[PDB]
Amino acid sequence: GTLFEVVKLGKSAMQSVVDDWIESYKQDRDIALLDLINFFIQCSGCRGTVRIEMFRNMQNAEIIRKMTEEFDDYPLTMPGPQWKKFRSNFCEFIGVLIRQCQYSIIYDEYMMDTVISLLTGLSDSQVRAFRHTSTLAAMKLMTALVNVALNLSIHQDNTQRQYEAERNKMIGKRANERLELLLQKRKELQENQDEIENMMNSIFKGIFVHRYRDAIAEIRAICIEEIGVWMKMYSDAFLNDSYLKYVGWTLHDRQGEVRLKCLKALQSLYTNRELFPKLELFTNRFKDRIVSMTLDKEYDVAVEAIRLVTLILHG
Ligand SMILES: CN(C(=O)[C@H]1CCNC1)c1ccccc1
């Protein structure tokens, strides 16, 4: 509208184009998902693009095989001023996309299933460009969903408090309308969080447990950093010995970049004198490796290992 109106309402090009994509998704899910598929293809530097006939007929396996052939050094590796902000932008786009879709579209069984299936497929590609782009996308996706789960939890607590105040207020009285709405609201929100847990499982089992072991050091670094982020954000789901294995194991990685990430992840956990209890078996298992890395070889890795060890000591 007016210049004052557009300034007082700071929609970035990303927020604006995610809002347009959502309007497009509501008119025609198929062309919207086709554009979202093409986005992830273009973001790998792949020169091909999927048309509706391929989308509606061909499996993701065939689409990826056909797009693999159309490959001429991809956006995420590019040096130059015109690609500086790409990684940061690509990451924020996925956050904005899912933040916006979090109350309706995410729970439709079509959109998240399409993306995750494409990303899982591209994460199994021989092409480094596809594996790098899809994995970083999946890692930021999981974190977007973890924030969705965090938001649900708040609404679940308020729906719970409201049901408690009504369940009490009745007692000896036939369960009125308000108590049946609240009892249904509460089922819905838990059923919503099951679907989020479901999507997180597909991403973890499909992408993470394969990509954290990837040939490319930067792909291993991307995975480790983000399981670190999930473990801090969403302690009860992600902070356990099964998931911690991956981070702790990777302390033996051959590259400074990756060993540096493992320590930064553990650092953020051990600062919180609260989930320190849940790190007791892990500290016992990997004290030797953590402690050894204080004289790592890579100065900066050693500095972090020392900072980690001084955090473990103080607790
Ligand atoms: C590496 N590790 C394991 O034993 C794996 C395999 C079975 N449980 C998880 C471990 C031990 C203590 C604390 C965290 C992880």
Of 105, 113, 108, nearest to 199 (Cα)? 113
Phi, psi for residue 254 in degrees, rounded to 5: -90, -10
What is the DSSP-derived secondary structure letter of residue 23? H
Distance 304 CA to ligand 1 centre (A): 22
Torsion angle (degrees, nearest 10) of CA 170, 175, 178, 182? 100
Is 190 domain-assigned? no
Pocket of ligand 1 (CB under 6 A): 241-242, 244-245, 248, 281-282, 285
Q: Are residues 203 and 228 in the same domain?
A: no
Q: Which residue's structure tokens are 């607790």? A: 315
Handedness of CA 28, 29, 32, 35 (dihedral sign): negative
Distance 93 CA to ligand 1 centre (A): 35
Alpha-carbon distance 231 to 132, whole Å?
Answer: 22
What count of other Cβ atoms lies within 10 Å of the Cβ of residue 267?
16
Q: Are residues 10 and 134 in the same domain?
A: yes
Alpha-carbon distance 178 to 244, whole Å?
Answer: 43
Of 86, 76, 90, 144, nearest to 112 (Cα)? 144
Is 235 domain-assigned? yes
- The range of the structural domain enclosing residue 262 comes to 219-315
Q: Where are the alpha helices (DSSP H) in 45-127?
A: 52-57, 60-69, 86-101, 111-122
Distance 263 CA to ligand 1 centre (A): 17
- Residue closest by Cα to atom 13 of ligand 1: 282
- Total number of domains in the chain: 2
Distance 288 CA to ligand 1 centre (A): 14
Resolution in A: 2.6
- The amino acid at 184: Q
Q: Are residues 98 and 242 in the same domain?
A: no
Q: Which atom of ligand 1 is nearest to the CA of 248?
A: 1
Q: Are residues 89 and 224 in the same domain?
A: no
Q: Which atom of ligand 1 is nearest to the CA of 282?
A: 13
Structure tokens at 311: 């955090």
Of 231, 219, 223, nearest to 266 (Cα)? 231
Segment holding 196, helix H or strand E:
helix 177-203
Residue 272's Cβ-count burial label (10 Å; 0-12, 13-18, 19+) is: middle
Asked if residue 312 lies in contact with residue 266, where contact means CB atoms within 8 angstroms, the answer is no
